[PDB]
Every structure is written in C-alpha cells, then in structure tokens.
Design a protein around this nucleic acid. Structure first.
Length: 930
RNA sequence: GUGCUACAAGCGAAAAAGAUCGCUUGUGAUUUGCACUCCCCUACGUGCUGCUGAA
DNA sequence: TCAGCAGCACGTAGGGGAGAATTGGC
DNA sequence: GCCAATTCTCCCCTACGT
C-alpha cells in the first residue's frame, strides 16, 4: 500500500564493473529493440484485426499479461492447447449464467465439467484467494464475477491473438530470437516487462494527446457555432480590418491578457467622454476610437478576438506524442532484479553481500558488498548465515525470495524491516567512472478508514452524513490543524474530540442543519515549532538579498541606457574588459532610474545625480542627466569607469559574502530548526539570477535551436538539494510533533484559488517558485502515512482574516503579519495570526462549515433596467438553513447577467468589497489611537 | 551512502569576460549532528535569461 | 512599465513500476 | 528428484471547491 525507497552503494571489482556495464548495455539495447519493433508494427500494420488486438492488450493490460505474452515475443510456447480450451470454456460460461437458469456456484462448476483448462487456483473456481479456505465457496453468484469474466476472456483472447500473430510469421522479434541463444530467459522476461511498462505509458499518453486535440477541435467548433460569427459577415469583416490595422504597427499582440484588459478599459472609461489611452498607444488609440463608433453600445472586440486565439492555439498544439527510445546514458533503463527477471540473492560473517546473476550464459555470478549507511545502529539479515566449508559458494536460489533485512540508523525512530522481493540496479557515471547502487523498497499496509470517516466533517449540513462513516470514526480521537506559513515554518493547534461528551465548547451535528447532537470537541493546546534562532544571520541574509536586487536593477539600467553592437575591448585596470557604446540617440522615455541602487553602489557620482532627488520623480532626473550630458562631456570614459566600478562592486561586495556565509555551516539543523532556511532558499535563486546576468550578458542570442552555452550546474543543484533538505526537516518536525502528542488526524489548507498564509507580495516572482505548497502537502502525506496518521485538506479562504471566536472580520495590519486585531467587547486586542488561522479552520471543520462569510453574487439586469443580485453546495446549504430557499429563480437565471461581483457578511448585513475594506480600515485604525 | 557543504592560481571553449563547464596542481577539510520515496515517459505552465522595440 | 524570438531550469497535472505460486520432462 | 513455462488479477461502502 505504501513503498519507501532506500539506496545503497555497492563496491565491486573492475572485472565485475565491466560485467555489469555489459549487462546494462544489453538491457538498454533489447528494450529499445522491443519498443521500436512494436512501434513499427503499430504504424505499418493497422489491419487483420489481430495486431490491433495485441496493441490494445499491451495498452490496457497488467504486467501479468506481459509475462504471459513474453513466451511468444521471444521464442515460442511449448504448449498452445490449454488457452483454446480456456477461451472456449469461458465463452460458454458467459453464454451460460446470462441465461439466468442457475443461481449457484455448484451448477456452474458442473456446467463447465472437466478438461476446461483452468488448472485450479483461479477466482471463478473455489475462490481460494491465498488460504484456499478448504475449498470454500460463497454460494450464489455475485455481480463482480459476471463483470470480470469479461476481462479474463479479454486476456485469454489477447494471448490467442498473439498466438495467431506468431503462427502467421510476424510476432517473433528477429533481434530477440537472435539473442535468445546467448542470453538467459529470465533476463528476457525482465526486459519484456520493463519495456512493456514504458510502452504502455507512452501509448496511454499518445491516446490522451490525440483526444485532447479532438476536444480542442470540438470546443472551437462549438465557439464558432454558438456566436454565429458566420452570420455576422459585416461584423467579422470590420473585426478583421481592425485586427489588420493593429497588426500593421510593431507593438501589437492578441492575448488573453489583452482581452481581459479591454473589458476593464474600453467598456468603462468610454462613458467618461475622454480617451483613457492607458499605455494604449497613439495610432492605436485613434484607430480604436474610430472603430468603436460602430459598436458603442456593445463589445464586439471581446467576443471576436477569441476566435483567432483558438485558431492559433489549435495550430500550435502537438498532434502525436513525442517518442523517446531508451539510451544507456540519455534515457536510462534500470534492471529490476527478482524471480521474474534477473536473479539475485543476499548472503551474510559481518558484511552483507549481494549476488547478481549474469545476463549471459556460462558466466559467474557477480558479488558486491552493500556498503552500510553513515551511522547504522543495527544492520542484519534474518537467515542463518554461519560460516562453513563452501557448501554452495555464491548460489542464487528461489524459495528465499522475500529476504528480511533489519536496519536502523541514527535518524530512524524504529527498527526498519525491509522484505526484498525486487531490487533495482542503478548506474551513475560521475567523474567518468561507473558506479552502482542497489535500491530496496520497504512495503507497508496502512489502514484506509480514517480518511472516509473524516469525510463526515466535510458534509454540507443539508443531508445526513454518510452512515458508513458515522460508525467508523474513533470515539476519543485527537485532531491537529496545521498552517504552513513562511517565516514561522509550522503552526499547529490540537483539539480533543469526545463522542460520549456532548457539552464541550464546540458542538458538532451529524444530520440536518440542527439534528442528532453527535458528540462535542474541546481545545487542548497550540504550538509553533519555528523560531528566528539568531537575528544576526537573518539581518546579514536580508542585507545581502537587497544588495543583490539593487545590483541587478543597476545592471538592468546600465544595459538599458547603453547601445551595444559597437562594443570595444580596451585595457583598463590591467584587464581587457568589454563595454558597450553610449551614443544611441538617447531618449527621454526612461523608466524610474534606480535611485536607491545608485545610492548604495556609490555610482551616483559618475552619473552626477545630486542628493536632491526622490524615488519616483524621473522628469527632474531626466533633465539632470541631460544637463550632465551637456555640461559634462560624459564620454565613453565615464561609462567605462561606471561599468568597471559596478563589476568591481558585484565581485568584491557580494560573492565573498555569499561564499563566507554558505561555508559557515549554519543550516545544519542541529537541535533547532532555523527559520532563515527560507530566506537562504530565496537568496540562492537570486544568486542564480545574478550569475546568469554575469554569464549571458554582452552576447548574441541563441539562434535556430543551437545548444545552450551554459548549464549552471553547481548553483542549481545546490538550490534543489537545499530545498529538499528543508522540506524534509520540516516534515520530520511535524511528524515528531504529531507522534509525541498522540495525534490521529492532521488538517491542512487548500489555497490554490487564493493564497493568504504565504507572503502577500504583489509580484508572483517571489512565490510558487522557491517553496511549493503541493510538495509540502505531499511530503506530509508521505511521512505521516508511515506512522498511521492521516491528513485531510479543507478550504481555508480568508483563514487569517476572521476572528477565531466571534467569526467577525478582523484586521490584518500591514506593518506586521504576526498580529490580528480583533474586537469582542468594544476593545481591540492582538492575537497570533497563524494560530488564529488554525483556530478558525478548526471551527469550520468541527461544525462542517455552518457559517459562511463570503458569497459571489452576480448582477442581473433586464430590458427594464431592474436589478436582482442573484447568488450562486455548502453555500446553498447555508441559505437553506437561514433563509430556507424556484421557477422565479430559473426565470432570473434566463436573464442576461451584467457582471460578477462578491458580497461579504459582517453579522446581519451583506456588504460589498469597497465597504468591507472600509470596515476593515475602521477596525484597524483604532490601533494608532491607543 | 546523499545533502545540509569548497576556495584560490594555471590552461584550453574562447574572439571580452571577474560568470558556467571540463582538466592539472594548491589549500582547511573528515563530521562536530540533523534529515532522507526513488526511477523513468508525456503535455503545457510558468517564470529565468540575453538581443531588439515600444508609452 | 509589456512586446517578439532562441535556450533553460522547476511546477502541475497526469502515465508505467519496486509478483506469488503451480506443473510436466525428468 | 526437478527447473522453464504458464496461469494468476475482488471483497469494496468517501467530499468539495475550481
């Protein structure tokens, strides 16, 4: 049910390593040959209704069928009789039972009779499962047997189709039959299994992509048919003329952003009687004004520009999935040793040795030592491995396939038992020398009833909770609600649910709106397992970060004001350097010159901006720069000095600091989780960006798919590994916290629609690129399913904007993110932010969203100019609970909707966004009074 | 075992490079303590990043 | 404060995978 | 005796917003 991986290096001799390289190359060659032959059969042949059946069985079958057909893909089948009897008997069984004259197992067993293939041990006879149960039978037929006899026959008929292909003279792959003499058959089965898995994945992907292109065609047809663009020939002609006139200019494009902005710009500012021209252009604004006279009262552009977007999107999308064959060094295939593939064994005096069977014939088995891990408390096998006088040497045997390895290191919390039945061989070519690792997976069966039983807390309070979940919840279960903000890495709260007690502070109902008072919940305690550690490290990191951003902005300004294409290499300061020209018909349309960057770098003197300036005024700055160009020569020498000084700054004030703090061994996470790991994660990305600027600058762009000049390996690998380490450490902290406080359920927030718990930066460059919410949730699932604690995700919109107790809209102050200002008795107090988010999520959970404070109502207008303000399952349940709410509703729905807005609740009133922000400002302004 | 976790000089890509990658020699390292589901294949989305143009 | 055109990480969703027991010629 | 070849696939019950 859950498999966790572990990688162990191997130490082998040079002869052994050459043997394994030969084996791996053979695997790759054979796998590529198999997939390529299958592709050739797919393309060249699509007739006879036989090859298509085999491709269908490979596409929609299990590994068991791959093993069944392997005996035909290579060589042949010794016996080809029992399958025909099996398909005949199963066809007759399907014809029977469908008659309905029998309703028992015994009648069917006599109906088949004897010599019906089916060599015992199958579901339709005696259903032995694994025990056999002394030939027990259920009695009457169920539905699942009649359902699955069909897939059983599908498998048998696929094997028959492969038999027919072989008998025709097309199935035995010439390469496989050529190699079969010199290679063991176990290897052939393993290669067939792995290559078939890869090809099945590819075939499903290709099917999905073709269906996607068909769906795109269908949706474009629906769009072009619903809007009747063919009927409006004149409107289409006018729209096409407008598009051509726009495309005449060199600064026009058609995009979803343009269409989204058109509705806000032209449909709104046109009523003011003046042209907005918000970065719209000079000729473009005049053309738009001239053409809009035909459709002043409507919006033809919004409804006409989407067709061209659909056409170009349909053109651009790929048709058939791109096909990659396996390569030993590019697209690796990794042998999966086992009883159905390459043989393997494990033997123990005090070192554990792995014996791998050779690919070829008449070659010895290979012996490796499983080199242990960094600090191994216990490390042992289970079989008796006492030394003797070479009873069997290195023997690979079945009857011992599930090897039992006990291992426990320092970081583990419990002795780990791994039942090896397959082991993966992996090859790495680091430093030009091949090395081998064996990968072992440990398996576990995790109980799967807590998720379903927790689903009863997510019902809408309009229908009774699912009965099968009402009787499976633990009686005295303890829940935890977690928030995963950035600066405080983790913040949780713990609640105690008592089925028996019905008088706790939180009450939960498991029926209609207020019915069946099923239990009650209490609050225990809330914690946060992050701290700032030392403030010096955080201060240094922040200073380096804004220094980096200042330097990057300065280099952007330097590039923008320059020209290039006439760059000169001149020996200045003992270095050849390379600077770009300055005379390029300088224009007065520059952006905000990085005045703060020019302050901090010390480069203002070169450009001669006085102290008298601000951070937004550019016309005065432009005039001052022009006057400096006039009065001062500001020749290429000044630009040369400016560039040299900025390069000197970036190489003597940034890189030494970054190195010295990187090599300082701060993020070792010993006895304390440092909150500065996240700031470091950001700064590594910033460093990558800066070094990219230092690398690709002053270069011609890449052309016609030429290979990339640079790779940026060290820094990228550093960033990735740092992110993985910090995620793992946070997950381990959460797991230990839950397990040390007797928690059975963890509740997380789904925030893809709106993110509030993370940073509130307007720019998206600093979010969803360094820290992934989805990976945090995935790691939590992975590390908690191991111990037996389940996590469930719930909606957390406006989590940190609500009062934990009164459910009022509290104020998130802009100065600090760690204080929420709340009134309860006419006075305002500050409460912890993320802790309060956990509290409100808990309140929403235990009451299964009894009260809502956010709805999206749509404005409805008719030909009479009236308004209706119609609202849009938990929401409908809420209405059904408070206002208790048809034909008039469909009548309003049929009316045209002017637009979509939202309504916010503040007690007994439902307000708009403007007045809601006004009320939040009202509740938050009293902070400065006190 | 990996990863928290590499610094300077040579030379070659190479015509500019203080960036990136590859080699050869230096130099502290040696874990001082934490954690560790790991392989491929798609499609399409983001930003990154140079060159150029626009209000 | 975006536009176009080459490379390029990683997301973000998907798609495969970490097999056991029987049975004739030996 | 015995290893290549060849048949094997269930047992459940669960939500909700984009």
């Amino acid at each position: 049910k859950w498999l966790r991986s572990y990688d162990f290096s191997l130490e082998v001799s040079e002869e052994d390593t050459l043997h394994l390289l030969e084996c791996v190359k053979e695997y790759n060659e054979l796998s590529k040959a198999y997939m390529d032959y299958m592709f050739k059969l797919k393309e060249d042949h699509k007739d006879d209704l036989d090859v298509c059946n085999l491709i269908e069985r490979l596409q929609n079958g299990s590994g068991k069928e791959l093993r069944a057909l392997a005996s035909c893909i290579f060589g042949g089948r010794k016996t080809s009789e029992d399958v025909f009897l099996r398909v005949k008997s199963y066809k007759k069984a399907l014809v029977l039972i469908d008659s309905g004259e029998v309703k028992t197992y015994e009648d069917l067993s006599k109906s088949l009779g004897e010599k019906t293939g089916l060599r015992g041990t199958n579901s339709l006879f005696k259903e032995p499962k694994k025990e056999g149960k002394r030939k027990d039978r259920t009695g009457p037929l169920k539905e699942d047997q009649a359902k699955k006899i069909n897939k059983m026959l599908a498998a048998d008929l696929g094997i028959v189709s492969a038999l027919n292909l072989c008998q025709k003279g097309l199935l035995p792959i010439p390469e496989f039959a050529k190699n079969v003499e010199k290679l063991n058959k176990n290897v052939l089965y393993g290669i067939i299994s792995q290559a078939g898995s890869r090809m099945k994945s590819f075939l499903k992907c290709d099917d999905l992509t073709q269906q996607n292109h068909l769906n795109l065609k269908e949706i474009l047809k629906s769009y072009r048919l619903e809007y009747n663009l063919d009927e409006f020939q004149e409107q289409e002609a006018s729209y096409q003329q407008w598009l051509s006139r726009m495309k005449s200019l060199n600064s026009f494009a058609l995009t979803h952003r343009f269409l989204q902005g058109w509705a806000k710009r032209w449909r709104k500012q046109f009523l003011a009687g003046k042209d907005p021209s918000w970065t719209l252009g000079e000729e473009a604004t005049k053309i738009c004004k001239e053409y809009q006279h035909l459709f002043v009262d409507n919006d033809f552009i919004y409804l006409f520009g989407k067709e061209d977007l659909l056409k170009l999107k349909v053109e651009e999308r790929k048709q058939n999935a791109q096909f990659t064959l396996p390569d030993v060094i590019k697209s690796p295939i990794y042998p999966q040793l086992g009883n159905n593939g390459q043989g393997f064994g494990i033997e123990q005096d005090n070192d554990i040795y792995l014996i791998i069977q050779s690919c070829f014939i008449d070659r010895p088995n290979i012996r490796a030592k499983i080199v242990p891990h960094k600090k191994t408390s216990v490390w042992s096998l289970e079989q008796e491995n006492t030394k003797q006088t070479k009873k069997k040497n290195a023997q690979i045997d079945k009857n011992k396939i599930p090897y039992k390895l006990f291992l426990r290191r320092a970081a583990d919390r419990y002795e780990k038992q791994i039942e090896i039945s397959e082991c993966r061989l992996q090859h790495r070519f680091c430093s030009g020398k091949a090395n081998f690792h064996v990968v072992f997976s440990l398996k576990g069966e995790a109980n799967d009833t807590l998720t379903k039983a927790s689903t009863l807390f997510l019902t809408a309070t309009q229908k009774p909770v699912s009965e099968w979940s009402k009787d499976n919840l633990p009686k005295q279960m303890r829940v935890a609600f977690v928030d995963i903000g950035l600066n405080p890495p983790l913040s949780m709260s713990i609640y105690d649910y008592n089925q028996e007690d019905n008088s706790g502070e939180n009450l939960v109902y498991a029926g209609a709106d207020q019915q069946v008072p099923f239990g009650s919940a209490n609050f225990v305690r809330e914690d946060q397992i992050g701290n700032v550690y030392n403030q010096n490290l955080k201060r240094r990191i922040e200073e380096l970060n804004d220094k980096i951003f200042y330097a990057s902005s300065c280099v952007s300004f330097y590039k923008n004001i320059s020209s290039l294409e006439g760059a000169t290499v001149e020996l200045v300061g003992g270095r050849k350097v390379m600077c770009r020209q300055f005379d390029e018909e300088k224009v007065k349309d520059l952006y905000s010159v990085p005045v703060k960057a020019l302050r901090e770098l010390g480069l203002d003197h070169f450009f001669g901006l006085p102290e008298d300036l601000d951070q937004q005024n550019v016309e005065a700055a432009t005039f001052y720069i022009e006057n400096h160009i006039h009065h001062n020569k500001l020749t290429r020498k000044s630009f040369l000095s400016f560039r040299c000084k900025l390069w000197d700054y970036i190489h003597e004030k940034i890189l030494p600091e970054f190195s010295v703090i990187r090599n300082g061994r701060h993020f070792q996470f010993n006895k304390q989780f440092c909150s500065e790991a996240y700031s470091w994660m950001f700064l590594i990305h910033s460093m990558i960006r800066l070094k990219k600027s230092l690398s690709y600058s002053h270069s011609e762009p890449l052309k016609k798919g030429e290979p990339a000049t640079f790779v940026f390996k060290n820094l990228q690998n550093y960033f990735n590994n740092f992110s993985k380490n910090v995620l793992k450490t946070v997950a381990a902290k959460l797991r230990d916290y839950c397990t040390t406080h007797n928690v059975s359920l963890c509740v997380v927030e789904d925030l893809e629609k709106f993110r509030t718990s993370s940073l509130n930066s307007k720019d998206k460059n600093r979010l969803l690129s360094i820290w992934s919410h989805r990976n945090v949730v995935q790691r939590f699932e992975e590390v908690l399913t191991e111990v037996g604690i389940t996590i469930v995700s719930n909606d957390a919109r406006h989590s940190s904007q609500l009062d934990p107790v009164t459910m009022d809209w509290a104020y998130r102050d802009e100065q600090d993110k760690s204080k929420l200002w709340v009134k309860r008795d006419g006075e305002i107090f500050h409460i912890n932010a993320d802790i309060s988010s956990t509290q409100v999520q808990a309140k929403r959970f235990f009451s299964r969203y009894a009260d809502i404070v956010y709805m999206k109502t749509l404005l409805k207008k008719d030909d009479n100019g009236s308004l209706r303000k119609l609202v849009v399952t938990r929401i409908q349940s809420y209405l059904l609970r408070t206002i208790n709410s048809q034909q008039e509703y469909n009548q309003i729905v049929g009316l045209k909707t002017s637009g979509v807005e939202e309504i916010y609740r503040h007690g007994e009133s439902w307000v708009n966004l403007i007045t809601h922000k006004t009320l939040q400002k009202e509740i938050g302004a009293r902070t400065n009074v006190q």
